[PDB]
Structure formats: C-alpha cells, structure tokens
Design a protein around this ligand. Structure first.
Ligand SMILES: *[C@@](O)(c1nc2cc(F)ccc2s1)[C@H](C[C@@H]1CCNC1=O)NC(=O)[C@@H]1[C@@H]2[C@H](CN1C(=O)[C@@H](NC(=O)C(F)(F)F)C(C)(C)C)C2(C)C
Ligand SMILES: *[C@@](O)(c1nc2cc(F)ccc2s1)[C@H](C[C@@H]1CCNC1=O)NC(=O)[C@@H]1[C@@H]2[C@H](CN1C(=O)[C@@H](NC(=O)C(F)(F)F)C(C)(C)C)C2(C)C
Lengths: 306, 306
C-alpha cells in the first residue's frame, strides 16, 4: 500500500541535459532538437550580477563564446537569442534523444519533478510544488541553475520550470521555459521577498483522503461544515480558500472513500484548530500540502508511462 | 540551499524494466544481458499462494509458458532456473540498454532508490531505507512486484532490492537480486511479523548536521555527553546503539560544521527527552532517519554521475 513523495522517472529528461560554459560561468542547459535552453545570466561573472544590463552584456558576446558540452562532445553554436530571462542557443546537432515534449507554465498548487544537475550531469530527482507565492522548496547548490522541472503525460514531457536562484528564506525561484519568472522575481543579486506563503488547502484534503485510503482514519470526526464556514477558519491559518472546483476535483477521492469533501473539511477544521495532538498521518506530524488530487489518484491506482 | 528526499536518476534502470507474464499472473522483471530476473511466485495463481511448493509448481512449467514483453516486443525464453525466491529466465536477445551493473545485498540503515513499475512500465521513483528490521516503507500497489531498488556509483548501477510483498503493518518486504529475502520473510501468503523497528541513530545525526549546514540550529544545546551515556538514553527510545564507526562516518559532517559528534548527540538526547516542543527541523516535525551520512554529504556537495 504505502504513500510517498514520488517523482516521475527522469530518463527522458536525462538525455536532454548538457553543460553550458560562457567565460568562467558554467551551468546546465536543456537540449531539445537543435536548440539549447539555459538561464541568460550565464553571460555574467560571479560578482557582477548586482544589477546587470543583459542586452549590453549579451551584445559583447558571439556564438563562439558559448561552450556547449554534451557529456564529452562539443556542439557548435550557430545562433543565439534572448527570450525574457532565458538564452536560446541554436546548434548544428539536433538532440537525437529529444523526447516528445511541450512547454507549459504551471499554476500555483501544481506539482512537478525536478532533475537537479551539476555540469550538465544528473545528481538526483525529487518532486516539488509551486507554492501559491511562486517559490519552490527544493535542494539546489551552486551549479544547479538551469536544472529543469517537468511532468510526464504518457510519452510527452511537459517542461514547466527552470531553476535560477535561491531567495533569502532558502526557498527557490525560477522561470518557465519561455523564460518568464514565476512570481515577482528578477534575475539579479538583490534582496527579494517571497510574499507570505499559504497552504494549498485542496492538496491537504487530497492527502487526508490518501490517508483514509491507506487505513489512517483516526482524525476523521463526527461533524461536517459549510464551504463558507470552512473557509472562514481556513483563512485564519493561511489556507488558500477552497472552492466548488476544488470540491469537484476531489470528486474521485470522495467517490473512492465515501467521505464527502465537506466531512473531510470538518475533520480538517478541527486539526488546524486543535493541532495533531502528537499523532501522525502517513508517518507525518505536519499537514502535507504538496500532493495534488491527481498525484494521490495516480499513486493509489498505479499510473505508468513510456 | 534546501534539503529533500532525493532519488538517483532512474534512466539507466528504466531501460531494464520488462513485463513478465505466466498464466494469469503478470509482474515486472529486470532485463540485464540475456537474463531477465523476476520473483519466482510469478508461477502462482492469485489465490493459491497460501503455501506453495515452488519446485512442484515450476516443474509443470516450460520456457514457452513465460511471456516476456519489452514495451511491445516478445523475447523468446530459452532457459529458466530458480534462485532462492527469484526466477531467472534466459532469453535470446541481450539487453542493448544493459548499464554497467552489479548486485549488492545492502545492510540495514543503508538507503537506495526505488523505481516502482506496473506491467514493466515505470510509474515513479522514490528514495528508501532498509529499516533495521529489513522492511521498507514504500508505495506499492498490485502489479508492483519485481520493481527494483538501486544505487548509482558513477556509471555503475548497484541493484540491491526486488519487491515481493506488503506486510500487515503496511510496510514492504523483498529480496536481493540473488533472491534472498531481507529479514525472516518467506514468499507465501501467511501472517508475518516484522519485528520491532528501531531508529537509525547515525542517520538522524547526519540529518541534524544537514539542518545545521542549512542554517537550522535552534535545537543545538550547551551540553555534551559520553558515548555510553548517549546510548543509555538511545536504547530507551529504540535507537540503534551508536558506535565509534558511526562517529568516524560522521567525521566529514563533524568537520564541515565544527560540531563534535558528541555535542550533536547531546542535542539529540534532549530532543528525544523533551520532544520538539512543536518546532520543525528542515520543515519536519519528526526526527528523520532515512538519510545516510553519505546521502547528506552528496546532497550538500552536489555529487553527479552518468
Ligand atoms: C546558479 O546556479 C547560478 N550560478 C551562477 C553563477 C554565475 F557565475 C553566473 C550565473 C549563475 S546562475 C545559482 C543557484 C543558487 C546557488 C546556490 N543555490 C542556488 O539556488 N543562482 C544564483 O547564483 C543566482 C543568480 C544570481 C544570484 N543568485 C542567487 O541565487 C542569489 N540570491 C539572490 O540574489 C536573492 F535575492 F536572495 F534571490 C545568491 C545571493 C547568490 C544566493 C542570479 C539571481 C542571476
Ligand atoms: C505483487 O505484485 C505480486 N502480485 C502477484 C500476483 C500473483 F498472481 C502472483 C504473484 C504475485 S507477486 C504483490 C505486491 C503487493 C500488492 C499490494 N501491495 C503489495 O506490496 N505481492 C503479493 O501479492 C504478495 C505475494 C503473495 C502474497 N503477497 C502479499 O503481499 C500479501 N501479504 C502477505 O501475505 C503478508 F503476510 F502480509 F506479507 C497480501 C495479503 C496479498 C498483501 C506473495 C507473498 C508470494
């Protein structure tokens, strides 16, 4: 049975990671067809990112200043464009490991897998959520920039995230693959606030259902509540307000457990209110909000791909 | 910065997963060179696993009763041997995706990655520990059997685990790739007790160091203790006794933080004794024991492979 933070298999993305060198700076890039994608600030020096002018910096750069290694093999760069906060290097060799792929800007609350790389080589893979405030709680060192986040949809990789920086709270920020930041973040070394973060109410519900499904039910109660009354107590705690869609999205889990969304919301209310009293749910002593409904369904059904 | 349960990239293992059908039973197998490995109880029916005689069952089986699909491609079986609780099917096609690989029986406390499959297709990947009692807390449904656990050591895959069953506590049991169970488990549908499980003391220390490294230090104290006095309080709580090796294995983390192992043990003592008082460490409200020292080092240094 059991229940874990589970990442998509990383194979299709592994064959897309390359190393990108420009001057002294090296970071990771993503090699799809005859394009490599990486963060534009690859054209900056370790110390001169306080407030770059990226046009001006880039203008002093030519294709030949860009060193794209794939394992131990140089690609020749034959074009370069800047798209928002991303650099797009055209290369002569198309990736023969290019998977079926698309580029998607995910929404807050949605999860995805990260393949953390150093020097175009995979370190490891983990599952993440886009916090409502457009940060992610990941594991990135120096060199991790240009590491990508993704979903798999059968055979099709949806890349949704490229890693750019770590904020002062230790949480992480980055772009879509078109190079637009999630959040109000900018690619420059200044103090930057992630706003107040909130709990992804619907995800926490999905997780409570995952508990029930896996035999953990102590926290079920003999109360219900209204949607409105539940939200009144949610907001106190910085839970995202729950809506009718949330209800309907939880439908399948509702259906599979026979617990109406609002009975679960009543269970949840008293957990926020009275805490966990030192028990655990699915081995956790906190309310976990980084599993989507879909994530729980997949895990409690066995969904595969290739 | 940040710190997460991180699995090895799953690519090299993905290309080894195949589906194995015998009668009505289908499960996963591992295709290395011209051998496929899977659990021997693939030769049982859904209901007749109460107490099989596997010799007798197997004797009524021929190569042609074994259907090895790789995606959409049949391998012909040309040999079959039973090795403890594993079946080894010789095939005509050698896997052309065979990685550098070895087979290792891990020790309790050691971690590894699981690539959970259904019908020879990857569902997802997660990191696991061999509990001191030789169970694992994983996420397995029906069809998951023959899913493998592994480590990567540069380019070399060390397979250490094959999944066989779920115990009544919901935790999971399985074999090495030579087919010997970890633990006192047997491949038959009877009530089976995992013994009392204990906390992997050294791993919890490694994690506390990982906290320190990532700026989380509140729980540090102004005490030390002896090794013996620490163990006296460990055992109360079902911590595995810590030894001098444990000390030395923590050396690198000791070194990197300037906190002697025994000062950390003193911090730890009072956490077991006084609990966490409702704070968290690396976002966790429990003491986490499924990161090895090595795991923490790798994560806090960036180790890659391919
Ligand atoms: C990443 O891998 C990059 N490194 C370099 C090195 C160069 F020489 C040029 C360009 C780049 S991108 C960095 C990933 C972080 C390393 C440690 N953990 C990380 O997530 N990202 C950065 O260095 C990043 C880039 C410049 C400054 N960055 C920061 O992450 C900085 N944070 C902040 O400025 C803030 F405000 F807290 F978000 C800092 C102080 C180095 C941690 C840029 C934002 C362009
Ligand atoms: C796995 O995938 C297998 N399924 C089948 C189906 C057949 F028809 C033949 C052989 C096999 S192996 C099962 C994985 C579990 C499914 C749900 N979660 C799992 O981990 N494993 C089993 O079905 C496994 C095999 C027989 C009975 N198994 C059990 O896991 C059972 N548990 C126990 O008997 C005990 F004691 F709790 F460990 C049970 C009751 C089905 C959960 C065997 C042990 C050979």
């Amino acid at each position: 049975s059991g229940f874990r933070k589970m990442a998509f298999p990383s194979g299709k993305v592994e064959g897309c990671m390359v190393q990108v060198t420009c001057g002294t700076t090296t970071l990771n890039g993503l090699w799809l067809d005859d394009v490599v994608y990486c963060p534009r600030h690859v054209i900056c020096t370790s110390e001169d990112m306080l407030n770059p002018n990226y046009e001006d910096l880039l203008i002093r750069k030519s294709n030949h200043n860009f060193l794209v290694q794939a394992g131990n093999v140089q690609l020749r760069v034959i074009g370069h464009s800047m798209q928002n906060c991303v650099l797009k290097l055209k290369v002569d060799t198309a990736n023969p490991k290019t998977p079926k792929y698309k580029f998607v800007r995910i929404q807050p609350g949605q999860t995805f897998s990260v393949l953390a790389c150093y020097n175009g080589s995979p370190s490891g893979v983990y599952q993440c959520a886009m916090r409502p405030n457009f940060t992610i709680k990941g594991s990135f060192l120096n060199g991790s920039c240009g590491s990508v986040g993704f979903n798999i949809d059968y055979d099709c990789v949806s890349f949704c995230y490229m890693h750019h920086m770590v904020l002062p709270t230790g949480v992480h920020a980055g772009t879509d693959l078109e190079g637009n930041f999630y959040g109000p973040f900018v690619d420059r070394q200044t103090a930057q606030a992630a706003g107040t973060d909130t709990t992804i109410t619907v995800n926490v519900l999905a997780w409570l259902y995952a508990a029930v499904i896996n035999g953990d039910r102590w926290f079920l109660n003999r109360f219900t509540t209204t949607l409105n009354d539940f939200n009144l107590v949610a907001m106190k705690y910085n839970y995202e307000p729950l809506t009718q869609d949330h209800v309907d999205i939880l439908g399948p889990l509702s259906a599979q457990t026979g617990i109406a969304v609002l009975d679960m919301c009543a269970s949840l209310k008293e957990l926020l209110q009275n805490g966990m009293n030192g028990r655990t749910i699915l081995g956790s002593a906190l309310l976990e909000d980084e599993f989507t409904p879909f994530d729980v369904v997949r895990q409690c059904s066995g969904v595969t791909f290739q």
